[model samples]
Target: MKLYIYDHCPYCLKARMIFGLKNIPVELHVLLNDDAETPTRMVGQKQVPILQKDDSRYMPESMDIVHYVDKLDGKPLLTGKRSPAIEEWLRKVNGYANKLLLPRFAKSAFDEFSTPAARKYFVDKKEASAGNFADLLAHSDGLIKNISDDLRALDKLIVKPNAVNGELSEDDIQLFPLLRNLTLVAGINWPSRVADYRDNMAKQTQINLLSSMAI
Candidate 1:
């Protein structure tokens, strides 16, 4: 198996970190978007982290790539017997991080990549994304506080002694990298209220698993 990836992509970094933690030996093809042979053209999405098993099979999404790699290695991240409540919580959390949090980070990053005239456009977009996230958080009693509560909930689930599904599950694996990326790479130091939330969660053992690869 081979992966087509970019170093700066959070999704690609997530996949790479998982592979490194598992000690999987898979070929990697790093591609620059400006390169003439960029795979996104063939894949129909302007995204990094495309996986190809052979001349035939190809995967475009990062989460799908992680699942595929897990199956290939035979040490699955998700236990097959997860409770429905846990599954629902994971889905909601993942949606919050991926759809809301990540887009804001992306908009800010895209601003740095824009030309002079387009820079303002992307800067505005970034502000809008940030404002949107702030609004979403406001709907809850406190956005950062709610996330801290959720993180504590997740920590309890993972750290329960002699728990049936021991250690960090797939949900933890997926969410940690995104949080790490936002805090470390995106430098989204806003609301200042979430600093403790970020600092506390950053100290987790599961987060330390990919510390070397982040940024």
Candidate 2:
């Protein structure tokens, strides 16, 4: 199997995590951000995290890809229920978190934006909805403070060091991607349990945290 993805995409990270969790070997193909034609031809739309199955068929949508891969062995890993508290918390964070992440993502060294055109392509699309990257970056201090408080609530929601509710669950699938993406930002003070969970999940999924390259 081969997974086509963008290094900085949260959805792509979700797909990648499942492969590592299942110990499934998959070839990773990083698509250039400007190259819409490749994914359009494969999945009929330009989206990251497209999977090429062993039968040489294509599949898209991160969660669908995750569930399909999980059931391949006839046993699903994500059986635990989702937490309403965490789901509510995630909704709040998503409201403004993209404002913090997208600007930094445009500046970060991701394989998707390796070339000048690819990088600009991403910046242009994001700036349309999010406004100027420079302006968003300028508000980082306040944004960091906002999420720091939000992180505290999540610290308490955690039920285990590795699993969010003491077992693999949909919550982990939804939650870990945001936490992993947040690693690209520099200032948010991660609470103890939240910090431990993100670190543990990163190791388990073989995904690299952006701490080494935090903007």
Q: Tell me the tens digit of each residue's lDDT in model 1 across 60-103.
A: 87777778777775777543344555557666655554534544
**Leading candidate by lDDT:** 2
Q: Tens-digit lDDT track for model 2 on 89-165?
A: 88788676778888778877588899999988888887645566667677788889889888888888899967788
**Each candidate's lDDT (Cα)?**
0.52, 0.84
Error of 1 at 204 (Å): 12
- Clashing pairs for predicted structure model 2, backbone only: none
What is candidate 2's CA lDDT for residue 114? Answer: 95
Predicted structure 2, TM vs. truth: 0.94
| Candidate 2 lDDT score relative to the true structure | 0.84
Question: Which regions of candidate 2 deviate over 4 angstroms?
Answer: 128-132
| Root-mean-square deviation per candidate | 6.7, 1.5
